[PDB]
Swiss-Prot record, chain A:
It holds the Pfam family Ribosomal_L35p. Belongs to the bacterial ribosomal protein bL35 family. GO terms for molecular function: structural constituent of ribosome. Keywords: Ribonucleoprotein, Ribosomal protein. GO terms for cellular component: cytoplasm; cytosolic large ribosomal subunit. This is Large ribosomal subunit protein bL35. NCBIfam families: rpmI_bact.
Swiss-Prot record, chain B:
This is Large ribosomal subunit protein bL27. It comes from the Bacteria. InterPro entries: Ribosomal_bL27, Ribosomal_bL27_CS. Pfam families: Ribosomal_L27. Keywords: Ribonucleoprotein, Ribosomal protein, RNA-binding, rRNA-binding, tRNA-binding. It comes from Escherichia coli (strain K12). Part of the 50S ribosomal subunit. Cross-links to the 23S rRNA. Cross-links to the A and P site tRNAs. PROSITE patterns: RIBOSOMAL_L27. Belongs to the bacterial ribosomal protein bL27 family. The lineage of its organism: Bacteria, Pseudomonadati, Pseudomonadota, Gammaproteobacteria, Enterobacterales. GO terms for molecular function: ribosome binding; rRNA binding; structural constituent of ribosome; tRNA binding.
UniProtKB/Swiss-Prot annotation, chain C:
GO terms for molecular function: structural constituent of ribosome; tRNA binding. The gene is rpmG. Pfam families: Ribosomal_L33 (PF00471). Keywords: Methylation, Ribonucleoprotein, Ribosomal protein, RNA-binding, tRNA-binding. Belongs to the bacterial ribosomal protein bL33 family. InterPro entries: Ribosomal_bL33, Ribosomal_bL33_CS, Ribosomal_bL33_sf, Ribosomal_zn-bd. HAMAP family: Ribosomal_bL33 (MF_00294). Surface exposed on the 50S subunit. Signal peptide: none annotated. GO terms for biological process: cytoplasmic translation; response to antibiotic; ribosomal large subunit assembly. This is Large ribosomal subunit protein bL33. GO terms for cellular component: cytoplasm; cytosol; cytosolic large ribosomal subunit. It comes from the Bacteria.
Length: 64, 74, 50
RNA sequence: CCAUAGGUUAAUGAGGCGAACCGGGGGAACUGAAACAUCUAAGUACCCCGAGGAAAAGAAAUCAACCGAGAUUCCCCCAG
RNA sequence: UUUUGUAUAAUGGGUCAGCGACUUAUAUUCUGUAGCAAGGUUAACCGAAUAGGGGAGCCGAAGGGAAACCGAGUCUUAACU
RNA sequence: AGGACCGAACCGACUAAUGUUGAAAAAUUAGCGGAUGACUUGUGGCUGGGGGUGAAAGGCCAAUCAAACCGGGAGAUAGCUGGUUCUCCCCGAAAGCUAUUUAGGUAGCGCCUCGUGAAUUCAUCUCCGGGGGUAGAGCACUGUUUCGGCAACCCGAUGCAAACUGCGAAUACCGGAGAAUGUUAUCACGGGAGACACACGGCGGGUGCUAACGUCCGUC
RNA sequence: GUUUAUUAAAAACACAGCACUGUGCAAACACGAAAGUGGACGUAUACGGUGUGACGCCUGCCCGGUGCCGGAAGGUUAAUUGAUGGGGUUAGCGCAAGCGAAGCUCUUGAUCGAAGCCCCGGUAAACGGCGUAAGGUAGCGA
RNA sequence: GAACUCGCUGUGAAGAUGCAGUGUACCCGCGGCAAGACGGAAAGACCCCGUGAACCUUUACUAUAGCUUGACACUGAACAUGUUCUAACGUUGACCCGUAAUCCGGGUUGCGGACAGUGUCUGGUGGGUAGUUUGACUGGGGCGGUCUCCUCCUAAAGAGUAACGGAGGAGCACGAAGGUUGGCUAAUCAGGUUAGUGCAAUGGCAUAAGCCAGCUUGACUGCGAGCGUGACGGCGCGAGCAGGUGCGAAAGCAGGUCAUAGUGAUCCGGUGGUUCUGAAUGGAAGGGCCAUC
RNA sequence: GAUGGUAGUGUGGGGUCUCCCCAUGCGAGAGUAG
């Protein structure tokens, strides 16, 4: 049978031009008042999945 | 009653005397100023000394207080 | 003891800042001039409920 | 009370069996979730009823998108 | 065999003969190899046909952005050194 | 008269020995209790599994009972234990970190392998440029301590310290330069892992009794 | 008398006797999706449940807790009911900004509302306690 | 497993027929005895472990049969909220018939009567019954203690480094305790920080980082060369650029606080905003994005 | 603030091994002349 996508992963990662994955940063959902503006501003832009994590992500997203 | 400690903070000299740096590079992390900001060096809010220019690290005993200064030589 | 509050723009945009306040010691509503990035001017911001 | 229940006889049919497939009435748990209750296993196993050479479904109170298609069924895509 | 470590007084086997454990299907990725190449390949099905037909599709030649949208750029921001 | 008495049949099963691959998957032998009763026995019947039945021991329900047996779901699940079959050649670990309802499991990273690619990329040594606060030492500081002089403080002499420092090595580590040597020994990316129970010995230590073939780190 | 068939026969179980409690008969209660059936072809001197265990002398104090029984003023409170406010849409009216009826619709949740619970009493041969509800009496006691 | 199967003292996976050294011992039965072969028997039942099982308990959790409450239905009339009524409904009263029948049905009558009872919904109660949960570390387990964060020592002069090792703290505070400019300098009773630091410890602090006053909101928004630290999620330091602001005469300094604790991923949802999306179309709902809870 | 000696120590080896010693390299602190 076809491999099933991990559907949670597909909602959190998107495949880039050269095959890496961008994700949204953690720590910007709530408890925002105590956080520095500098901290929160740097958590806005999407970031790339790191080398160690790529194997985990690719397993989850076989039709990425 | 014991059995506590905190995470080690990875303070210390990151670039030693005569190493080439880019501007922005951290030179020492510290609590307070064991080392002081010399020429072409800033002092961050946690007393991190960092290069303001590209160049080489230069530590020096300088001042009347025998104090240790970090400077970047061009 | 400190309670989170909304500093809300007088400019009429909806840019709010957030901060804390000891309401027991400072019962009066806090007011500060701060940069509103919608209108791009320093305007009066006045305390409101979080 | 007319009646109706009831009673008797006649004619006709049914009954019971059979591997799967088919429609319907009921319907688990182990298991997976690295525990577990939502969830899963699964409308599966199993029990029951009924049928036929097949069954079921079927000629739009259907889709579509302002263009159009034209009952049902099955196969390949769409698409993990 | 299991262990840091077994002649071990740890495990298993009385012996022989026969049998006894990484498979199969589908999807996906990488390597090798073959074909064709900015293209490649068809599925069901048709066909008496391992032929031939069938290009429905799928993958690829473009990316960026949550998206509208823009496009060798695009997003970010009022705007980028 | 009697859940009366003694005692066979009959029904039991208190003690001991034997037997324990038995004569027997519960008996035999010698004794033992009830023996007109809430007694005992033949034949047949009824109660069915979270159910029965129980003068209640979780007893008994076909030599099976804190949920019978048979078939099915079924190859339940098994982070556990065992086992895993012909040959040669090359390379060759780990028993660590981090996280974990985690600790004998697993994941990422470290270490192994195979491939691709590329810098004098890497190592040793020499010279050069660095930061140390350890060993040692010391006693001005924080404390501790002895003696003398004066008597609140301080001074002279003398020691002690992992959490003392007016000092301070060797080494190690970072960076730069140069030669020789070394099958690129280096780094990156990609395919495949295993491993995350370590042991002893040397050195530096915590713990323990400078006890342990003890225990916990660092390093060889 | 009974019991762990097959390591326990006993001080265990049962027992007559005692007490509490339920039960008015289509009884309570039990088996049963139900129909029924047992209880019983019995009827409170009966039947079920519970504890105690011949007989003798006896069985003290505590109702604060938990349960059970009784009460129902007051509070709280379900389905139900859908006031009242707000939104969506758009006939209209706006040169435009907006506004906006009705209908439909999304939401809000007033009012109504029982038992229970809180609350007020009772009850220990109810579960229990006996230096706070009350502090262990009689008898007995290494 | 195979045996050509001695003692002793050592050694050694730490209690040896098999190793070392040494002693003793011709080959082979038969009757006896059980000290050893950690003899045979049963994948230890004790003990621990497994995110095993079962059954049992309860004021563990979640359900649920049963019991119980009310609304609506079956379910009506007349008067007044209650009472009367009969016709639904009940009857495990009587009688009649089917019928030879203590079943059942139909009929007649009595009694009860819109009650009771049952269905759906609903609150209560509910170990009666069911499914499950009930952490880990640990010089065995339990009991005790501990679990995240900060500071010091252990830590072997870069970083890092364990133990149920040795000592202490945090889970905030502050619109001033922030920013800047200008002043100002302690403990203590002789001197120079031996004081001060919003709160532990360490490192800092006179250019004060201490203290005071005036003026202020840079406790700014968008970004960010480069770097530190992490397996990763992350976390941290940061010139400089754009916009706009404060203090200062100006150079300048200011993106919170002497620094290092004062913290919680994701999901789900709330609030406001929005050159986004809007399942025929316009809207809307919902979703996205931004800010925040 | 020398010199000298002492302490420590990298590498290799050794012992009577809680501690030392030898070879070689590095070599304080304190104190002293000044
Ligand atoms: K289940
Ligand atoms: K599991
Ligand atoms: K073992
Ligand atoms: K054994
Ligand atoms: K393959
Ligand atoms: K290929
Ligand atoms: K760009
Ligand atoms: K059963
Ligand atoms: K791993
Ligand atoms: K590899
Ligand atoms: K070692
Ligand atoms: K007996
Ligand atoms: K009471
Ligand atoms: K020997
Ligand atoms: K023997
Ligand atoms: K009624
Ligand atoms: K331990
Ligand atoms: K032990
Ligand atoms: K600026
Ligand atoms: Mg948000
Ligand atoms: Mg620390
Ligand atoms: Mg599970
Ligand atoms: Mg037929
Ligand atoms: Mg048909
Ligand atoms: Mg048309
Ligand atoms: Mg072992
Ligand atoms: Mg050996
Ligand atoms: Mg042996
Ligand atoms: Mg063996
Ligand atoms: Mg074993
Ligand atoms: Mg064996
Ligand atoms: Mg595209
Ligand atoms: Mg007798
Ligand atoms: Mg018997
Ligand atoms: Mg006998
Ligand atoms: Mg007798
Ligand atoms: Mg007799
Ligand atoms: Mg028992
Ligand atoms: Mg039996
Ligand atoms: Mg069971
Ligand atoms: Mg199954
Ligand atoms: Mg199996
Ligand atoms: Mg080799
Ligand atoms: Mg951590
Ligand atoms: Mg020392
Ligand atoms: Mg020290
Ligand atoms: Mg070097
Ligand atoms: Mg492990
Ligand atoms: Mg380990
Ligand atoms: Mg270990
Ligand atoms: Mg180790
Ligand atoms: Mg040692
Ligand atoms: Mg030792
Ligand atoms: Mg050991
Ligand atoms: Mg007797
Ligand atoms: Mg017995
Ligand atoms: Mg016996
Ligand atoms: Mg009856
Ligand atoms: Mg009794
Ligand atoms: Mg008694
Ligand atoms: Mg009430
Ligand atoms: Mg009373
Ligand atoms: Mg021996
Ligand atoms: Mg013999
Ligand atoms: Mg014998
Ligand atoms: Mg044995
Ligand atoms: Mg075992
Ligand atoms: Mg009713
Ligand atoms: Mg219950
Ligand atoms: Mg239970
Ligand atoms: Mg289960
Ligand atoms: Mg369980
Ligand atoms: Mg444990
Ligand atoms: Mg260090
Ligand atoms: Mg070191
Ligand atoms: Mg540590
Ligand atoms: Mg380590
Ligand atoms: Mg370690
Ligand atoms: Mg520790
Ligand atoms: Mg960059
Ligand atoms: Mg500007
Ligand atoms: Mg502060
Ligand atoms: Mg502070
Ligand atoms: Mg939800
Ligand atoms: Mg929105
Ligand atoms: Mg629409
Ligand atoms: Mg010298
Ligand atoms: Mg000297």
């Amino acid at each position: 049978p076809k491999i099933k996508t991990v559907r949670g992963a597909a909602k959190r990662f998107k495949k880039t031009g050269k095959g890496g994955f961008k994700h949204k940063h953690a720590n910007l959902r709530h408890i925002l008042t105590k956080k520095a503006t500098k901290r929160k501003r740097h958590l806005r832009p999407k970031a790339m999945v790191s080398k160690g994590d790529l194997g985990l992500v690719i397993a989850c997203l076989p039709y990425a | 009653r014991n059995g506590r400690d905190s995470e080690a903070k990875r303070l210390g000299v990151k670039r030693f005397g005569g190493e080439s740096v880019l501007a922005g590079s951290i030179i020492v992390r510290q609590r307070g100023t064991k080392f002081h900001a010399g020429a072409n060096v800033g002092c961050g809010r946690d007393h991190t000394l960092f290069a303001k220019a590209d160049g080489k690290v230069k530590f020096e005993v300088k001042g009347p207080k025998n104090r240790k200064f970090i400077s970047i030589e061009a | 003891i400190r309670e989170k509050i909304k500093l809300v723009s007088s400019a009429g945009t909806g840019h709010f800042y957030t901060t804390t306040k000891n309401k027991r010691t400072k019962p009066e509503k806090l007011e500060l001039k701060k940069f509103d990035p919608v209108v791009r001017q320093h305007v009066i911001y006045k305390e409101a409920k979080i």
